[PDB]
Amino acid sequence: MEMEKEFEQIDKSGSWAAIYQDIRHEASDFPSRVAKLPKNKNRNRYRDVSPFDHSRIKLHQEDNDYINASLIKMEEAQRSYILTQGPLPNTVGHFWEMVWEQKSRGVVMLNRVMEKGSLKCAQYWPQKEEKEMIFEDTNLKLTLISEDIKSYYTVRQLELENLTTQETREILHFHYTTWPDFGVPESPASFLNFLFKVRESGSLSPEHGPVVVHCSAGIGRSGTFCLADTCLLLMDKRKDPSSVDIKKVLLEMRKFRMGLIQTADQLRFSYLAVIEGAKFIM
Ligand SMILES: COc1ccc2c(c1)OC[C@@H]1CN3C(=O)CCN3[C@@H]21
Numbered sequence: 237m238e239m240e241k242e243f244e245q246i247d248k249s250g251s252w253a254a255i256y257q258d259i260r261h262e263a264s265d266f267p268s269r270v271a272k273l274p275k276n277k278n279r280n281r282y283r284d285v286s287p288f289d290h291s292r293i294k295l296h297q298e299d300n301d302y303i304n305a306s307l308i309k310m311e312e313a314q315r316s317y318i319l320t321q322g323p324l325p326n327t328v329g330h331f332w333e334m335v336w337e338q339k340s341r342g343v344v345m346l347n348r349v350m351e352k353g354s355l356k357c358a359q360y361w362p363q364k365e366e367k368e369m370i371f372e373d374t375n376l377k378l379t380l381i382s383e384d385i386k387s388y389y390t391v392r393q394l395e396l397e398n399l400t401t402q403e404t405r406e407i408l409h410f411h412y413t414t415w416p417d418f419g420v421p422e423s424p425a426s427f428l429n430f431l432f433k434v435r436e437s438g439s440l441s442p443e444h445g446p447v448v449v450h451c452s453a454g455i456g457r458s459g460t461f462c463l464a465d466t467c468l469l470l471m472d473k474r475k476d477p478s479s480v481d482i483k484k485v486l487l488e489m490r491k492f493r494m495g496l497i498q499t500a501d502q503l504r505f506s507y508l509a510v511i512e513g514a515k516f517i518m
Pocket of ligand 1: 424429
């Protein structure tokens with residue numbers, strides 16, 4: 237079926253939970269043996285969210301190459317994304333090592349450091365120009381260059397220096413700051429505006445390594461971001477845009493990381509975002 241009328245048909249019939257459970261039943265199951273090794277317990281935030289072995293990002297290290305991060309490679313859309321958990325106190329150096337080694341231009345953050353009165357990720361970037369951060373375990377230096385605070389999101393320019401070679405690179409930090417503590421946003425307008433700002437920066441384009449996108453577990457809000465982006469791109473590429481099947485795209489993405497889209501409300505919100513976005517594109 238088309239999307240917008242499939243949408244109203246699920247609303248009128250109140251069957252979002254059944255649609256979402258079908259997706260959970262059909263989703264791929266691949267091994268995640270490296271994630272479950274005892275030496276990696278303090279590298280995982282949640283015991284039930286792990287990268288598959290076949291698609292995990294490897295650190296360029298011989299001691300321990302493990303990080304909780306996955307490469308989502310979308311062949312028809314010609315887009316790739318790295319989805320990862322919010323960094324932990326003992327993985328902030330690994331996080332920036334990955335950004336460096338994968339040649340990423342942008343980092344997309346979809347959570348606040350504290351939500352619901354609890355810590356959802358480490359404070360992993362510097363808040364003042366004159367107070368830079370040094371990650372001694374991976375030999376990197378990180379400096380805040382500029383910050384632009386808007387009503388729904390903040391953009392930061394950061395300098396990452398490989399202290400071993402003295403090479404430097406400019407990284408863009410795109411921080412969506414207004415996702416509610418509970419539920420999903422009422423309108424997709426600010427999320428779509430944010431997606432378009434990431435696109436306009438070059439951070440999603442083939443001349444750079446894959447964008448790094450995270451929330452707390454790296455599957456829920458993060459899944460919504462890449463699902464909406466890929467669906468909108470396919471609608472621009474194909475002769476028949478009504479042929480784009482958001483459930484089929486989501487199942488394709490779940491071949492590369494488990495659990496993408498965590499609730500039926502997040503599934504409905506993803507439909508809404510793609511539907512509204514397809515009108516603005518034209
Ligand atoms: C309903 O809220 C929105 C907000 C923004 C957009 C949208 C819908 O649909 C796709 C449009 C494409 N466009 C740009 O290129 C910049 C933002 N804007 C997008």
